[PDB]
Amino acid sequence: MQKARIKLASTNVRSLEEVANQIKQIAERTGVRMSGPIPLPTKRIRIVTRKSPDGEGSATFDRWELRIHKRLIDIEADERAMRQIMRIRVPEDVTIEIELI
Amino acid sequence: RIIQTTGKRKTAIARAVIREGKGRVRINGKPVELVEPEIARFTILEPLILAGEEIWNSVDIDVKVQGGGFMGQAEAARIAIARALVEWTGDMNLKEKFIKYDRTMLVGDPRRTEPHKPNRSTKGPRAKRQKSYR
Amino acid sequence: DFRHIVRVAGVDLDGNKQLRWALTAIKGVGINFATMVCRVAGLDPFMKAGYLTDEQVKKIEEILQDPVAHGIPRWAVNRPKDYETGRDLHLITAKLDMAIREDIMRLRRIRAYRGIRHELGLPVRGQRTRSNFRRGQTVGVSR
């Protein structure tokens, strides 16, 4: 109970699904319910710039862009699983945050 | 029993609900009879006048819309209302008349705006500045 | 009772126009100051100006000559805080341009920066002048 809430957020999309399915399976193997990964809106940061150092020539621009995929998981609290999700060993380009309600 | 359909028109969505009643129809709470820009009131009464004052008096419809403007939501309403009427009565000698008069009453419109490009970029994709020789 | 030409404090005003526009002509009374005085006096701003009996002209002339004491507030007045005395005043045609003229001469005396521009007939409020403000006549080189 107290329904922990975990929030993953990373820029590589693939390397997120694997930690998601780890959490899903760990929950399943033991006895606990869970709300599947709820996709939250992507946050894409965009930066428009000119292209030439000097000021001569026509004006042509760039569009750099960086996308950040998020998720959200709701799960109960059993120490058999509350612990089981501690040896999960996230990758280095992912963020995780845990908190109960 | 109830039915419910949808209609989209360049950023405007419409959810309809149809069921038996006295022949009244609301839109966001407004009665259809009170829509001020007459050219947008005659736009959502074409399905309900092309079916006749007999079917139009045995149903209640009530839609909800959001987005767009006074003419990009009238057409959403019309699409949803046509798609609902073609199921309640559920015939085809009426569905046919919904393709001779206007084919889009059932297939909708696949058109959206087009992004802007860098020469003015606040006026449109193809409009540019004014050339200056000499 | 109808008339065609009436006069109040100098400039004479038409008689087939509404009362609020008929007063606009008096140099010193715009449109937003006319609505005010017509309201404070006690009569409509839509009555035909020719229908002004003369005691009402006396009323209007009273008001235009010290309006602060009748209800016209002192944030809506031709000039507040008179440079010679802190009284709040509203001037009209003859007294107006003279007051501005002496407010200009005062800056001409001390030889400020805002007085010399008034001298030479140039911008006063910080504009640019490479490209506009061409109040002169073209110059040629050769052809």
Binding site: - | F42, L45, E46, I49, E53, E75 | -
Partner: protein, 213 residues
């Protein structure tokens, strides 16, 4: 203005809910298969026809008329005197105002003559459409102005355009309105009067078209 007309509900699939194009009758065999007169309650097609060759054949005549008054005037070619560039106060995209002026135009026409306004309109768009033209054909090195024949569709386009421009020059800096100046043009053209602009342009085209056959 009267609340019975401000709030108006039809119960018949007519044109604008008022007039019925069941008895009008086109005389010219050339322009018959291009002037559409189907039921079509509301005149609005949302610009789907301007994608397909000969698409504008199946578009109601009232919509072809309403679209050719959504414009500012004469912007690079003088009309009876001057340019009439009127930007930011022209009705370029405002289809509501266009539909309104045409509604009132018909309401005036129906009163001063007494016929189905669309019959008067279909008379106006034949006594104003000319069927001879000019060009330049280069042949073996040189060209010279020669006379040609105008296909029907282009006849119709030119007709409606000149009616538009005729009405849109008497409401210009003059006391007369726009809806009534769209009537003092159709009642004239449909009667072959010289004082018109759409008819006079037909005569002064056909003249300098014949004189160089």
């Amino acid at each position: 203005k009267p609340l019975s007309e401000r709030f108006f509900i039809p119960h018949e699939i007519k044109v604008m809910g008022r007039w019925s194009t069941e008895d009008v009758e086109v005389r010219d065999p050339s322009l018959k298969p291009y002037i559409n007169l189907e039921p079509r309650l509301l005149p609005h097609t949302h610009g789907r026809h301007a994608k397909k060759h000969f698409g504008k054949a199946n578009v109601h005549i009232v919509e072809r008329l309403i679209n050719k008054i959504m414009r500012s005037g004469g912007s690079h070619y003088k009309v009876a005197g001057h340019f009439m560039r009127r930007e930011h106060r022209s009705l370029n995209s405002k289809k509501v105002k266009a539909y309104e002026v045409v509604k009132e135009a018909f309401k005036i026409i129906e009163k001063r003559t007494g016929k189905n306004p669309i019959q008067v309109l279909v008379w106006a768009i034949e006594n104003a459409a000319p069927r001879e033209d000019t060009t330049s054909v280069m042949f073996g090195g040189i060209r010279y102005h020669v006379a040609v024949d105008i296909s029907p569709m282009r006849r119709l386009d030119v007709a409606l355009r000149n009616i538009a421009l005729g009405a849109s020059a008497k409401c210009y800096r003059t006391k007369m309105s726009f809806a009534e100046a769209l009537a003092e043009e159709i009642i004239l053209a449909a009667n072959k009067d010289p004082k018109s602009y759409a008819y006079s342009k037909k005569l002064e085209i056909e003249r300098i078209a014949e004189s160089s056959r």
